[PDB]
């Protein structure tokens, strides 16, 4: 930290540029000089105002301070699941609490993005989709098919807590009840909605109508695995106890708890342990389910104005042809195409709640930047490490749009 | 005949095999279009995991029989 300039001195720039400020303490960037008076943002969400407040309290805590040093992780991009399982489950929680140093073996936040897509792959029988259209994930009760899973839940929990610990977002959509369960809150019929819509519809109908003559249920529940139905008693001798309008309320209470928590009690326990090793139970509960969801997944909604406003240029001007076309091309794309462009440049499709001004780089806050490099014949390259895109100065729109759409496709 | 293999994503793939083919032959046909190592493959029929060395005749697997594929771990 250099002091002030001697009286009468002044700084100037060889080229036209705007100066912003990077706070490495809170990992944010702003247009306002901290040495200058800064008015509060007017017209801001009362729910984000408090979330803003809560996160500040949260992150600035004894257990949420990085231990000076560095935790090294080395994995192959084509086998990141098994490789990460070793690298992570080998190291102790305290070692994971020190600055992350991820490297990919073979070629030498995108690591978290790739890992999420693998941890929550239904093929592994750890997590499963809710129904078959909306792909929000919940825990697969049939995880027992692989005697190793209990460790993998502890591992998946570690990654989830680790991501939260280091400002890293996970690209996964948990069911509503799962966020409440992580806060150790109580789960009700309302939460059955997101978990299982079919069960919700049926259970809700029972409480609104008579069942004596229309239904012949018992205090049991049947879940089918591998084309084979297995039934379980809700209470001792449940499958032998008839369900009537007298004890229907008791049946509904029992079924919801089963279908949600009791059904995965063992797997969720292993998962909840791994998560707590990094994020202490007593300090997570400061957030509700909506606020916790943002702290894990972040925002997937890409805004063009926010994006454009907080972009740096290396060798370019915002008024340059190629840049003008770049934003025209970006504006025309949908939210999936834009998120695909992000994945390409930063390695993840998630965005901090505050916006692009707080976009995270490998060594801290790194604003989206477009560099003037590469020949017009070549495709655009990207340095994920710096949230930067090497953009050749194409002389026509169509070519740019084509080379751009290709590069983001090549990387998948 | 022709058999069906259901994945945990809700999708099912059609596979052509006679009731004398080995299980590892079925897995190699799965990798042939899904790119999944027969090593990581778990084939479940009627709630029972199958053995590579055995055939389809051992488990009296007829046509349109649905097998369930699951991935191993470590």
Describe this structure in words.
The complex is a heterodimer of chains A (412) and B (74). Chain A is of the alpha/beta class and 412 residues long. Chain A has three domains: 219 residues, Hect, E3 ligase catalytic domains (Hect, E3 ligase catalytic domain fold, Alpha-Beta Complex), CATH 3.90.1750.10; 78 residues, Hect, E3 ligase catalytic domain, CATH 3.30.2160; 115 residues, Hect, E3 ligase catalytic domain (Hect, E3 ligase catalytic fold). Helices cover 39% and strands 13% of the residues of chain A. In chain A, the strands form six sheets. Chain A has a four-stranded mixed β-sheet. In chain A, a hairpin with a 2-residue loop joins β7 and β8. In chain A, α6 crosses α12. Chain B has one domain: Roll (Ubiquitin-like (UB roll)). Chain B is built from one helix and four strands; from the N terminus they run ββαββ. Chain B has a four-stranded mixed β-sheet with strand order 2-1-4-3, covered by helices on one side. The chains are: A alpha/beta (412), B alpha+beta (74). The interface between A and B is medium-sized, with 20 and 18 residues. It is classed as ligase.
Which CATH top level class of the largest domain in chain A fits? Alpha Beta
* E-strand count of chain B: 4
How many strands, which pairing sense, and closed or not: the largest β-sheet of chain A? 4 strands, mixed
The total domain count of chain A is 3
* CATH architecture classification of the largest domain in chain A: Alpha-Beta Complex
Q: Strand order across the biggest sheet of chain A?
A: 9-12-14-13
Give the class of chain B from helix and strand content and strand pairing.
Answer: alpha+beta
CATH topology of the largest domain in chain A: Hect, E3 ligase catalytic domain fold
Percent of residues of chain A in beta strands?
5-15%
The name of the CATH topology of chain B is Ubiquitin-like (UB roll)
Task: Work out the strand percent of chain B.
Answer: 25-35%
- Domains of chain B (count): 1
CATH structural architecture of chain B? Roll
- Can you identify the CATH superfamily of chain B? Phosphatidylinositol 3-kinase Catalytic Subunit, Chain A, domain 1
Portion of residues within helices of chain B: 10-25%
The main sheet of chain B orders its strands as 2-1-4-3
